[PDB]
Write a protein that binds this ligand. Sequence first.
Ligand SMILES: [Cl-]
Ligand SMILES: [Cl-]
Ligand SMILES: [Cl-]
Ligand SMILES: [Cl-]
Ligand SMILES: [Cl-]
Ligand SMILES: [Cl-]
Ligand SMILES: [Cl-]
Ligand SMILES: [Cl-]
Ligand SMILES: [Cl-]
Ligand SMILES: [Cl-]
Ligand SMILES: [Cl-]
Ligand SMILES: [Cl-]
Ligand code: NA
Ligand code: NA
Ligand code: NA
Ligand code: NA
Ligand code: NA
Ligand code: NA
Lengths: 106, 106
Amino acid sequence: GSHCQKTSLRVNFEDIGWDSWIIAPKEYEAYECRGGCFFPLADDVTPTKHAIVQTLVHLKFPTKVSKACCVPTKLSPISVLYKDDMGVPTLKYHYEGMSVAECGCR
Amino acid sequence: GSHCQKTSLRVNFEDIGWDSWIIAPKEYEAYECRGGCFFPLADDVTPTKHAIVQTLVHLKFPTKVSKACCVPTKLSPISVLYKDDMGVPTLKYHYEGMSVAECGCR
Ligand SMILES: [Cl-]
Ligand SMILES: [Cl-]
Ligand SMILES: [Cl-]
Ligand SMILES: [Cl-]
Ligand SMILES: [Cl-]
Ligand SMILES: [Cl-]
Ligand SMILES: [Cl-]
Ligand SMILES: [Cl-]
Ligand SMILES: [Cl-]
Ligand SMILES: [Cl-]
Ligand SMILES: [Cl-]
Ligand SMILES: [Cl-]
Ligand code: NA
Ligand code: NA
Ligand code: NA
Ligand code: NA
Ligand code: NA
Ligand code: NA
């Protein structure tokens, strides 16, 4: 519906220069938040008042003030197999903030 | 330093069609978050891992994946004088989420 939402983003750790310390997995589903912040809103979302006020000021003064932005509002962990100070392969069971759980306009 | 930060944004309630129910004040300091999300980061900020990973994927695939976005990460209340169901002028002492307290890349 052209509104702020979660969509797929497969991240390869080698592509981002993290494969020097992340051994596994090779790739993971990080998701991303894409779409607009405009009126009217999706009826099942959690908007802030600052995002609604800024979006309205944007409409009136579009060259000076930016619209609201679609961003992750909650993140989930993943497990990684990483190399510790000596190099030993070690499991990090809950590696926080790697994957989008919820999107919203902020 | 061209990095994500708090900057002034004076909001007039009439400009955004809220003066029908907000009587006072006329205008308030809402702030906004402006600036880039790029490497290297400001050394005193609170970045998420998803924002760092997405920014790096953006660098590699700039046409497909967007960069991180500079947004409010904490909001503060203001007091408003508002009209209640009958029209009586009523103070809302803590009207949440009207003003930026902190900015960050998300
Ligand atoms: Cl991709
Ligand atoms: Cl996965
Ligand atoms: Cl709406
Ligand atoms: Cl629509
Ligand atoms: Cl809010
Ligand atoms: Cl962690
Ligand atoms: Cl203005
Ligand atoms: Cl003020
Ligand atoms: Cl950095
Ligand atoms: Cl710099
Ligand atoms: Cl994080
Ligand atoms: Cl409130
Ligand atoms: Na990718
Ligand atoms: Na995954
Ligand atoms: Na303008
Ligand atoms: Na304004
Ligand atoms: Na104020
Ligand atoms: Na590309």
